[PDB]
Amino acid sequence: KEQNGDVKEAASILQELQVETYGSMEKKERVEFILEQMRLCLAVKDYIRTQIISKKINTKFFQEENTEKLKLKYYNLMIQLDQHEGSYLSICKHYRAIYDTPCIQAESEKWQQALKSVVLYVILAPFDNEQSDLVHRISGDKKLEEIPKYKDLLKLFTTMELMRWSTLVEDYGMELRKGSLESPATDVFGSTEEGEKRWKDLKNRVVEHNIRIMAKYYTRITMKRMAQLLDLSVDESEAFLSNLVVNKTIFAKVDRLAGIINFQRPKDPNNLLNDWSQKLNSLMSLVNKTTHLIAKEEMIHNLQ
Amino acid sequence: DSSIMMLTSDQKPDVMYADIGGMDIQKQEVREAVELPLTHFELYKQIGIDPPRGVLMYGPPGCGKTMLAKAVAHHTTAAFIRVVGSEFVQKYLGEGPRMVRDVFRLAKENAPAIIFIDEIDAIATKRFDAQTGADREVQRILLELLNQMDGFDQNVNVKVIMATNRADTLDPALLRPGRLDRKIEFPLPDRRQKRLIFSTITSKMNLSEEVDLEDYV
Amino acid sequence: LNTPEDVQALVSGKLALRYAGRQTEALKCVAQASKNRSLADFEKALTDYRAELRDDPIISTHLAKLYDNLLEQNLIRVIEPFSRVQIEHISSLIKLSKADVERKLSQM
Amino acid sequence: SHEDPGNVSYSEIGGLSEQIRELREVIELPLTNPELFQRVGIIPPKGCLLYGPPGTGKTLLARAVASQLDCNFLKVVSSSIVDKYIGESARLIREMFNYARDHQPCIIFMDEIDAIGGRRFSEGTSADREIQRTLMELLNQMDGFDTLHRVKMIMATNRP
Amino acid sequence: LHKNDIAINELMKRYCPNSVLVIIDVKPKDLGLPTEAYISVEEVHDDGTPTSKTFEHVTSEIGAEEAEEVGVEHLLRDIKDTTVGTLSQRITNQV
Amino acid sequence: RPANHRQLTFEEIAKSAKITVNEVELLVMKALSVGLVKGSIDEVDKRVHMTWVQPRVLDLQQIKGMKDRLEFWCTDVKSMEMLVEHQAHDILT
């Protein structure tokens, strides 16, 4: 409080944390004091000092059940800690722990920004199983689908609507203008920092999603028509597909001499399932056609 | 079955051959005794050597006896069996015979089985019960051990090794060349294996950047 | 040994700084070139100090760091081909050294 | 196993100076965080020996923090390993550990390390290596060769 | 099938809800398959009548049980299991 | 269209679809995402590839397809099954 502290005041309190843990019985005073050195070491700019002291934070469990919403209200401070130094799967539990204070506050402003901060981070999360059910867990809010950007956001989630990226840039660059609510748009888009890497993460998502659905929908395709149908440039697809091959999880194929490129099976090594599919699948359905067309013969021969 | 059975399934002892600190005496000779004759058997053929029966390692307790044995178990090739000498002795004054029955029939039941016997106590069990103070008991299980030491086949590929610092309840007929031939006694420390082992133990602890360890060599 | 951090820390040692000179400059430049695996830096500061480079008769360790790095470089450059590949696909994807840094890949 | 009672306070008699703090380090803190020891790479503190007087540092004043912690507090009075079919000793060592490591940070507690009814003789006739091989297979399945997942040994005796 | 089928369907459903009747033949010289199985559900129609309990068909099949051919396969004696390669599949082909 | 042409052009698509030459890729990839057909289109020449589909009846009461394919196939595999019998005449022996 003298000079609003510094690193050397923080250097006092960091050795004055490890002593003051285990002497007496305490649950809450260390939490509502434990906020202080974490908002110090976020301003010490290191963020691995923040993760060292986060390794000091996480070792205290049973932090729910503090009576009269006392640390549920501290959850705004714990997310204020874990805002920057949390990656895009840390933001999932982060932005679902954001809901606990507006859970009973009903709050048509801070629960409204709880709605927007719980809607605007699913795309930020990578392509994983947790995306695949978090899109169904954002399914279940009541006034979030009143926001048409939730309709746009669920519209991005199943083949993403083969579109122009800048139209979605319109629809989601309106959100920094939108309302008094601006901080989810700050955290995702209105940042000249990690949020600009979230802009480029949305770039990653749109070209990566063109890969995700079109790598199913490829038989033969030209190079530059792809490159301009990826909502981006032609020669820039050199780097913009070298990243998608250090993605290294799609086996692919390209030709630069003729442009005919292709994402497909490893070049028909096993010819069997053509025979198996046709004969077994369809023609055993056809030998079932005997078994159930005599049944439908009995259907029509009810009245015949 | 052998202590569970035949290098009890999943257990690497997780002591690296590289984790051993410069034992160019120990590693080379133990390699020649056990790790080599499984591989280059035709050189033993081509020179007609009749390879050695079993190394007798000893020395100070903690210069890498059990470490080296468990490290050969870590980097084994054949059917190793980990055996502690008296973890399963069952007051049969002469269960060492049933041990060697397991050895025989399980080394030819498996691939040749390499069996190290740790904590050599298998002569002196706890229900010594005869006339004088286990003179003829310890002596009878020693001479019994000798009886199932002289006639394996010279060709039953079982590597037998002993490691304690106590050859006093052990018969000095076990030191006749032909049975426990290889004499190796380990150095206590020495110089430059302080360098080697001071380097190797720091493979995981994270070394605060100038706190050096040549001073301690 | 492939521990370049300790090469840095032990040219930073006190007796290395007691008997410093030019062969330690060769060791430090080759050390940083191995620390960052820059093959151009490696070959460059290799050729710069040839009179001190003879005193290691094992240039095979050096050209094997070249070679044994170039293995996994052509591994990450034999899987990178099927995304958007360029001029020859078999000659000059290899970091465009001059045009003919190979007879190495083809030699392998 | 689970006849094991507890104390109605941490201070059932008194004298908790090193007791609370050092027993707290030897049990509870690396079970909360193994990565601190994984800056070094070693298992958790291999366990003190509560020796001293028979009854202020032997069986009483042993369950102070145990009352507070309540994780895997079993009893081993170490007479149950000296068996009938004498190789059931090591089998019941397996039955001790392979039943213990469920409550995952385990409390290996052993009052009266060498306990059977009566007194003990010396290094002559049969007051012998029962204890040594039994105790080395104990130490075998305690640490050294075989253990798993932040199990805390606690030895507590002065009788043997 | 006939019209009384739905009446004994009405009474067979009150004993078991998912009941199933069996159309048989007394002399199957068939392809062949053995006797039939239905399923009685209510789909009523596109017509708007009171409830139509029209007989839907269950695909019928046959299982097996230990010790139930002991004398019968002994009497036939014409049992030929392992000959697939000349006849047992050309019968299926023809069929 | 009377198949055996399944890998085909694009101008009939851009003519019957009342769409242009350019907007057939949106067409085919969105129509695959709908779920009435599942064939991965040869996109390099705008060449169609198709799968399972939903019918709207054949020749006016299905005369022609039924006869000339179904009964033609009937006598095909029936008579060549008789030929299987003819060469397999006494291999049952």
GROMACS .gro file of C-alpha atoms in nm, chain A:
model
  304
    1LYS     CA    1   0.000   0.000   0.000
    2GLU     CA    2   0.306   0.227   0.038
    3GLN     CA    3   0.383   0.277  -0.333
    4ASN     CA    4   0.123   0.027  -0.459
    5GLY     CA    5   0.400  -0.235  -0.440
    6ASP     CA    6   0.661  -0.360  -0.687
    7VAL     CA    7   0.851  -0.679  -0.766
    8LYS     CA    8   1.053  -0.635  -0.446
    9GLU     CA    9   0.735  -0.608  -0.242
   10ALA     CA   10   0.628  -0.915  -0.437
   11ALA     CA   11   0.971  -1.061  -0.355
   12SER     CA   12   0.885  -1.008   0.011
   13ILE     CA   13   0.543  -1.166  -0.016
   14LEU     CA   14   0.654  -1.470  -0.221
   15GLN     CA   15   0.880  -1.589   0.057
   16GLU     CA   16   0.604  -1.469   0.291
   17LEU     CA   17   0.363  -1.715   0.130
   18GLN     CA   18   0.536  -2.049   0.191
   19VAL     CA   19   0.561  -1.995   0.568
   20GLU     CA   20   0.205  -1.879   0.637
   21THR     CA   21   0.016  -2.183   0.512
   22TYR     CA   22   0.013  -2.459   0.771
   23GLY     CA   23   0.043  -2.300   1.115
   24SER     CA   24  -0.317  -2.246   1.224
   25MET     CA   25  -0.655  -2.357   1.094
   26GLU     CA   26  -0.772  -2.133   0.810
   27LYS     CA   27  -0.980  -2.165   0.498
   28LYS     CA   28  -1.073  -1.823   0.362
   29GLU     CA   29  -0.830  -1.551   0.472
   30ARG     CA   30  -0.552  -1.707   0.268
   31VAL     CA   31  -0.781  -1.717  -0.038
   32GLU     CA   32  -0.896  -1.355  -0.016
   33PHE     CA   33  -0.531  -1.274   0.049
   34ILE     CA   34  -0.405  -1.523  -0.209
   35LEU     CA   35  -0.560  -1.306  -0.479
   36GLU     CA   36  -0.307  -1.037  -0.394
   37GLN     CA   37   0.017  -1.204  -0.499
   38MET     CA   38  -0.144  -1.346  -0.812
   39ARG     CA   39  -0.251  -1.000  -0.922
   40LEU     CA   40   0.106  -0.905  -0.832
   41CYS     CA   41   0.277  -1.174  -1.041
   42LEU     CA   42   0.049  -1.107  -1.336
   43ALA     CA   43   0.189  -0.752  -1.320
   44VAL     CA   44   0.542  -0.893  -1.279
   45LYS     CA   45   0.481  -0.977  -1.651
   46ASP     CA   46   0.661  -1.314  -1.632
   47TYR     CA   47   0.353  -1.549  -1.647
   48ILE     CA   48   0.573  -1.845  -1.554
   49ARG     CA   49   0.617  -1.677  -1.220
   50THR     CA   50   0.237  -1.678  -1.243
   51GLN     CA   51   0.247  -2.049  -1.325
   52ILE     CA   52   0.492  -2.123  -1.040
   53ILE     CA   53   0.261  -1.947  -0.799
   54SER     CA   54  -0.028  -2.124  -0.974
   55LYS     CA   55   0.150  -2.446  -0.874
   56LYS     CA   56   0.135  -2.288  -0.531
   57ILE     CA   57  -0.237  -2.208  -0.579
   58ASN     CA   58  -0.368  -2.542  -0.705
   59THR     CA   59  -0.231  -2.743  -0.410
   60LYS     CA   60  -0.518  -2.607  -0.192
   61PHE     CA   61  -0.829  -2.810  -0.275
   62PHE     CA   62  -1.184  -2.818  -0.133
   63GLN     CA   63  -1.242  -2.459  -0.236
   64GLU     CA   64  -1.612  -2.497  -0.316
   65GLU     CA   65  -1.882  -2.483  -0.042
   66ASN     CA   66  -1.760  -2.154   0.109
   67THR     CA   67  -2.076  -2.022   0.260
   68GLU     CA   68  -2.298  -1.736   0.133
   69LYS     CA   69  -2.138  -1.747  -0.215
   70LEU     CA   70  -1.814  -1.619  -0.067
   71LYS     CA   71  -1.565  -1.787  -0.300
   72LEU     CA   72  -1.810  -1.838  -0.582
   73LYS     CA   73  -1.777  -1.458  -0.589
   74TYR     CA   74  -1.399  -1.508  -0.571
   75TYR     CA   75  -1.430  -1.709  -0.895
   76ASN     CA   76  -1.420  -1.378  -1.083
   77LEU     CA   77  -1.080  -1.325  -0.920
   78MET     CA   78  -0.958  -1.678  -0.994
   79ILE     CA   79  -1.055  -1.638  -1.358
   80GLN     CA   80  -0.890  -1.294  -1.344
   81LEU     CA   81  -0.580  -1.490  -1.252
   82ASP     CA   82  -0.617  -1.762  -1.510
   83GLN     CA   83  -0.732  -1.539  -1.799
   84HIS     CA   84  -0.408  -1.483  -1.989
   85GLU     CA   85  -0.188  -1.781  -1.901
   86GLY     CA   86  -0.461  -2.035  -1.984
   87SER     CA   87  -0.448  -2.205  -2.322
   88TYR     CA   88  -0.748  -2.293  -2.536
   89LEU     CA   89  -0.848  -2.598  -2.334
   90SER     CA   90  -0.779  -2.421  -2.008
   91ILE     CA   91  -1.030  -2.162  -2.133
   92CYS     CA   92  -1.298  -2.432  -2.141
   93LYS     CA   93  -1.302  -2.499  -1.768
   94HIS     CA   94  -1.214  -2.132  -1.720
   95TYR     CA   95  -1.516  -2.008  -1.918
   96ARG     CA   96  -1.741  -2.264  -1.751
   97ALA     CA   97  -1.622  -2.161  -1.406
   98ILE     CA   98  -1.721  -1.810  -1.518
   99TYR     CA   99  -2.084  -1.920  -1.492
  100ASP     CA  100  -2.085  -1.994  -1.118
  101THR     CA  101  -2.126  -1.635  -0.992
  102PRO     CA  102  -2.399  -1.542  -1.247
  103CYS     CA  103  -2.552  -1.886  -1.179
  104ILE     CA  104  -2.754  -1.737  -0.900
  105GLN     CA  105  -2.737  -1.369  -0.983
  106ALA     CA  106  -2.982  -1.370  -1.280
  107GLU     CA  107  -2.821  -1.040  -1.364
  108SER     CA  108  -2.924  -0.918  -1.709
  109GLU     CA  109  -2.568  -0.752  -1.754
  110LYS     CA  110  -2.301  -0.971  -1.588
  111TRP     CA  111  -2.491  -1.289  -1.664
  112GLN     CA  112  -2.537  -1.141  -2.013
  113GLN     CA  113  -2.161  -1.109  -2.045
  114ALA     CA  114  -2.139  -1.455  -1.891
  115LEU     CA  115  -2.351  -1.561  -2.191
  116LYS     CA  116  -2.116  -1.389  -2.434
  117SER     CA  117  -1.798  -1.505  -2.262
  118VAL     CA  118  -1.941  -1.860  -2.258
  119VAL     CA  119  -2.038  -1.837  -2.625
  120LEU     CA  120  -1.732  -1.674  -2.781
  121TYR     CA  121  -1.469  -1.936  -2.694
  122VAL     CA  122  -1.576  -2.268  -2.847
  123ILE     CA  123  -1.408  -2.189  -3.182
  124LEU     CA  124  -1.101  -2.088  -2.980
  125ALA     CA  125  -1.090  -2.443  -2.845
  126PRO     CA  126  -0.908  -2.682  -3.085
  127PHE     CA  127  -1.062  -2.966  -3.284
  128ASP     CA  128  -1.120  -3.226  -3.014
  129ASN     CA  129  -1.388  -3.430  -2.840
  130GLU     CA  130  -1.443  -3.146  -2.592
  131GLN     CA  131  -1.554  -2.926  -2.878
  132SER     CA  132  -1.791  -3.202  -2.992
  133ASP     CA  133  -1.989  -3.201  -2.667
  134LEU     CA  134  -1.931  -2.841  -2.563
  135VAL     CA  135  -2.128  -2.748  -2.875
  136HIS     CA  136  -2.407  -2.953  -2.717
  137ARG     CA  137  -2.352  -2.796  -2.375
  138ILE     CA  138  -2.383  -2.445  -2.513
  139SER     CA  139  -2.702  -2.605  -2.642
  140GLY     CA  140  -2.914  -2.559  -2.331
  141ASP     CA  141  -2.895  -2.191  -2.255
  142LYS     CA  142  -3.215  -1.993  -2.279
  143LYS     CA  143  -3.133  -1.636  -2.381
  144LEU     CA  144  -2.806  -1.700  -2.566
  145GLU     CA  145  -2.988  -1.807  -2.881
  146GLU     CA  146  -3.164  -1.472  -2.856
  147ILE     CA  147  -2.823  -1.343  -2.970
  148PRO     CA  148  -2.808  -1.409  -3.348
  149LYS     CA  149  -2.432  -1.450  -3.318
  150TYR     CA  150  -2.510  -1.775  -3.135
  151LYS     CA  151  -2.702  -1.879  -3.447
  152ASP     CA  152  -2.399  -1.780  -3.656
  153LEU     CA  153  -2.179  -1.970  -3.409
  154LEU     CA  154  -2.384  -2.291  -3.421
  155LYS     CA  155  -2.398  -2.235  -3.798
  156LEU     CA  156  -2.019  -2.257  -3.802
  157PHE     CA  157  -2.035  -2.600  -3.636
  158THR     CA  158  -2.155  -2.851  -3.899
  159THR     CA  159  -1.973  -2.806  -4.236
  160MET     CA  160  -1.949  -2.436  -4.130
  161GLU     CA  161  -2.153  -2.318  -4.437
  162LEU     CA  162  -1.914  -2.301  -4.740
  163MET     CA  163  -1.885  -1.922  -4.728
  164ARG     CA  164  -1.675  -1.611  -4.761
  165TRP     CA  165  -1.477  -1.548  -4.445
  166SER     CA  166  -1.527  -1.170  -4.453
  167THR     CA  167  -1.906  -1.203  -4.417
  168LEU     CA  168  -1.846  -1.375  -4.085
  169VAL     CA  169  -1.589  -1.100  -4.019
  170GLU     CA  170  -1.880  -0.856  -4.060
  171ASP     CA  171  -2.107  -1.061  -3.832
  172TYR     CA  172  -1.839  -1.087  -3.561
  173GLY     CA  173  -1.671  -0.749  -3.598
  174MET     CA  174  -2.003  -0.598  -3.511
  175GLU     CA  175  -1.959  -0.748  -3.163
  176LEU     CA  176  -1.698  -0.495  -3.049
  177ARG     CA  177  -1.957  -0.229  -3.130
  178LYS     CA  178  -2.241  -0.439  -2.982
  179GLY     CA  179  -2.388  -0.318  -2.655
  180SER     CA  180  -2.223  -0.207  -2.335
  181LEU     CA  181  -2.087  -0.563  -2.334
  182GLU     CA  182  -1.744  -0.543  -2.495
  183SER     CA  183  -1.501  -0.751  -2.284
  184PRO     CA  184  -1.564  -1.093  -2.448
  185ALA     CA  185  -1.510  -0.915  -2.779
  186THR     CA  186  -1.197  -0.766  -2.618
  187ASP     CA  187  -1.069  -1.104  -2.497
  188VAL     CA  188  -1.131  -1.277  -2.830
  189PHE     CA  189  -1.110  -1.002  -3.091
  190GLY     CA  190  -1.044  -0.661  -2.935
  191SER     CA  191  -0.691  -0.749  -2.830
  192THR     CA  192  -0.373  -0.623  -3.000
  193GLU     CA  193  -0.216  -0.928  -2.834
  194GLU     CA  194  -0.332  -1.294  -2.795
  195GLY     CA  195  -0.674  -1.191  -2.929
  196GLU     CA  196  -0.510  -1.098  -3.258
  197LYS     CA  197  -0.367  -1.447  -3.250
  198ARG     CA  198  -0.729  -1.550  -3.192
  199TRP     CA  199  -0.819  -1.367  -3.513
  200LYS     CA  200  -0.546  -1.572  -3.677
  201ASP     CA  201  -0.678  -1.874  -3.489
  202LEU     CA  202  -1.012  -1.811  -3.661
  203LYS     CA  203  -0.811  -1.799  -3.985
  204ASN     CA  204  -0.657  -2.130  -3.877
  205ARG     CA  205  -1.007  -2.263  -3.806
  206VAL     CA  206  -1.157  -2.164  -4.141
  207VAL     CA  207  -0.875  -2.306  -4.355
  208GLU     CA  208  -0.853  -2.602  -4.117
  209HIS     CA  209  -1.226  -2.659  -4.149
  210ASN     CA  210  -1.203  -2.647  -4.526
  211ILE     CA  211  -0.947  -2.923  -4.472
  212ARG     CA  212  -1.171  -3.104  -4.222
  213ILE     CA  213  -1.482  -3.132  -4.440
  214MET     CA  214  -1.324  -3.116  -4.783
  215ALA     CA  215  -1.070  -3.386  -4.695
  216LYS     CA  216  -1.378  -3.601  -4.687
  217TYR     CA  217  -1.511  -3.435  -5.000
  218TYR     CA  218  -1.203  -3.480  -5.225
  219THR     CA  219  -1.165  -3.703  -5.524
  220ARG     CA  220  -0.959  -3.484  -5.759
  221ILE     CA  221  -0.902  -3.109  -5.725
  222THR     CA  222  -0.687  -2.838  -5.879
  223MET     CA  223  -0.435  -2.647  -5.668
  224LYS     CA  224  -0.510  -2.280  -5.723
  225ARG     CA  225  -0.889  -2.322  -5.733
  226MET     CA  226  -0.848  -2.476  -5.389
  227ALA     CA  227  -0.614  -2.193  -5.288
  228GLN     CA  228  -0.872  -1.927  -5.377
  229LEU     CA  229  -1.160  -2.133  -5.234
  230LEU     CA  230  -0.983  -2.144  -4.897
  231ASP     CA  231  -1.090  -1.777  -4.842
  232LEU     CA  232  -0.725  -1.683  -4.908
  233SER     CA  233  -0.457  -1.640  -5.177
  234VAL     CA  234  -0.276  -1.871  -5.421
  235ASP     CA  235   0.099  -1.857  -5.350
  236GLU     CA  236   0.025  -1.788  -4.984
  237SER     CA  237  -0.110  -2.145  -4.974
  238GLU     CA  238   0.258  -2.257  -4.966
  239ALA     CA  239   0.285  -2.159  -4.601
  240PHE     CA  240  -0.093  -2.193  -4.555
  241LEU     CA  241  -0.068  -2.565  -4.636
  242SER     CA  242   0.277  -2.634  -4.493
  243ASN     CA  243   0.108  -2.562  -4.161
  244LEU     CA  244  -0.163  -2.812  -4.256
  245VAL     CA  245   0.100  -3.077  -4.322
  246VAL     CA  246   0.284  -3.011  -3.999
  247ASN     CA  247  -0.070  -3.072  -3.881
  248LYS     CA  248   0.047  -3.418  -4.007
  249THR     CA  249  -0.280  -3.591  -3.912
  250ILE     CA  250  -0.431  -3.599  -4.263
  251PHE     CA  251  -0.258  -3.820  -4.515
  252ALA     CA  252  -0.275  -3.619  -4.834
  253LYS     CA  253  -0.133  -3.579  -5.187
  254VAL     CA  254  -0.046  -3.288  -5.417
  255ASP     CA  255   0.104  -3.243  -5.761
  256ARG     CA  256   0.257  -2.912  -5.860
  257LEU     CA  257   0.340  -2.991  -6.223
  258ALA     CA  258  -0.024  -3.026  -6.331
  259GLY     CA  259  -0.210  -2.884  -6.032
  260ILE     CA  260  -0.432  -3.193  -5.994
  261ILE     CA  261  -0.415  -3.260  -5.621
  262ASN     CA  262  -0.608  -3.502  -5.406
  263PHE     CA  263  -0.680  -3.611  -5.047
  264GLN     CA  264  -0.771  -3.978  -5.044
  265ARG     CA  265  -0.709  -4.337  -4.926
  266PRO     CA  266  -0.351  -4.472  -4.968
  267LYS     CA  267  -0.406  -4.567  -5.337
  268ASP     CA  268  -0.632  -4.880  -5.329
  269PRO     CA  269  -0.397  -5.135  -5.164
  270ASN     CA  270  -0.684  -5.369  -5.078
  271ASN     CA  271  -0.945  -5.421  -5.349
  272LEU     CA  272  -1.171  -5.647  -5.144
  273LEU     CA  273  -1.438  -5.422  -4.998
  274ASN     CA  274  -1.565  -5.327  -5.343
  275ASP     CA  275  -1.662  -5.693  -5.386
  276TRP     CA  276  -1.765  -5.717  -5.021
  277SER     CA  277  -1.976  -5.400  -5.026
  278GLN     CA  278  -2.162  -5.486  -5.348
  279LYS     CA  279  -2.204  -5.862  -5.298
  280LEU     CA  280  -2.243  -5.888  -4.919
  281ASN     CA  281  -2.398  -5.549  -4.832
  282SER     CA  282  -2.623  -5.484  -5.132
  283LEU     CA  283  -2.680  -5.839  -5.255
  284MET     CA  284  -2.745  -5.970  -4.905
  285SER     CA  285  -2.997  -5.691  -4.881
  286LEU     CA  286  -3.119  -5.841  -5.209
  287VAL     CA  287  -3.143  -6.189  -5.058
  288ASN     CA  288  -3.328  -6.018  -4.777
  289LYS     CA  289  -3.552  -5.872  -5.049
  290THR     CA  290  -3.682  -6.225  -5.090
  291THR     CA  291  -3.739  -6.255  -4.713
  292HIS     CA  292  -3.919  -5.922  -4.677
  293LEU     CA  293  -4.074  -5.890  -5.023
  294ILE     CA  294  -4.261  -6.209  -4.955
  295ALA     CA  295  -4.354  -6.025  -4.634
  296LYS     CA  296  -4.472  -5.730  -4.841
  297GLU     CA  297  -4.638  -5.978  -5.073
  298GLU     CA  298  -4.826  -6.088  -4.763
  299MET     CA  299  -4.889  -5.718  -4.688
  300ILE     CA  300  -5.055  -5.660  -5.024
  301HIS     CA  301  -5.218  -6.007  -5.010
  302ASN     CA  302  -5.393  -5.915  -4.692
  303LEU     CA  303  -5.616  -5.724  -4.933
  304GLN     CA  304  -5.538  -5.978  -5.203
   0.00000   0.00000   0.00000
